[PDB]
Amino acid sequence: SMNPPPPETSNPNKPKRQTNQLQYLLRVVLKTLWKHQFAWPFQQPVDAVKLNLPDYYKIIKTPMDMGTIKKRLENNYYWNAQECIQDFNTMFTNCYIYNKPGDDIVLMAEALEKLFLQKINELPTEE
Numbered sequence: 001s002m003n004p005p006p007p008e009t010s011n012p013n014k015p016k017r018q019t020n021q022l023q024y025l026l027r028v029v030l031k032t033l034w035k036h037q038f039a040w041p042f043q044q045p046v047d048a049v050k051l052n053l054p055d056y057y058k059i060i061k062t063p064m065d066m067g068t069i070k071k072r073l074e075n076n077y078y079w080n081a082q083e084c085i086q087d088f089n090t091m092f093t094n095c096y097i098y099n100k101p102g103d104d105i106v107l108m109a110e111a112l113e114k115l116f117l118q119k120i121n122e123l124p125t126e127e
């Protein structure tokens with residue numbers, strides 16, 4: 001019935017950083033996924049109410065979406081690339097867990113994940 005509050009994108013008690021890797025994650029990785037024709041279901045938190053996705057937040061207790069990731073990067077929320085990569089992987093995994101294998105939304109996530117891995121293969125060394 002109700003949706004939970006979306007994930008935080010900034011916190012005044014969590015230290016903030018910019019790194020060249022995090023800049024690549026925003027400017028190259030996130031933007032490359034975001035343009036994809038299959039990105040739109042992943043661009044905002046799941047509205048379980050409007051999507052009619054039964055039990056979404058009964059099953060998924062660590063929701064994540066690319067809009068949240070984008071805003072985290074914009075706000076210097078991540079300390080390191082591993083934290084950001086983990087959020088992408090949580091987003092994909094949530095899709096694989098909630099939906100049935102082979103579902104069209106799963107095909108979309110798999111296409112985005114393949115592309116994500118292409119792009120992170122080229123993550124620069126830290127400056």
Ligand SMILES: CCn1cnc2c1c(=O)[nH]c(=O)n2Cc1ccc(CNS(=O)(=O)c2ccc3c(c2)CCCC(=O)N3)cc1
Nearest residue numbers: 038040041042046051053094095098099103104105107108
């Ligand atoms: C990712 C969060 N999220 C947002 N909407 C979500 C979810 C979720 O987890 N589960 C869901 O069923 N939902 C609803 C939902 C949202 C969207 C869709 C997919 N609609 S489509 O793009 O026109 C489409 C149609 C045919 C098709 C594909 C994609 C896959 C590739 C080509 C292919 O062979 N078949 C199907 C279900």
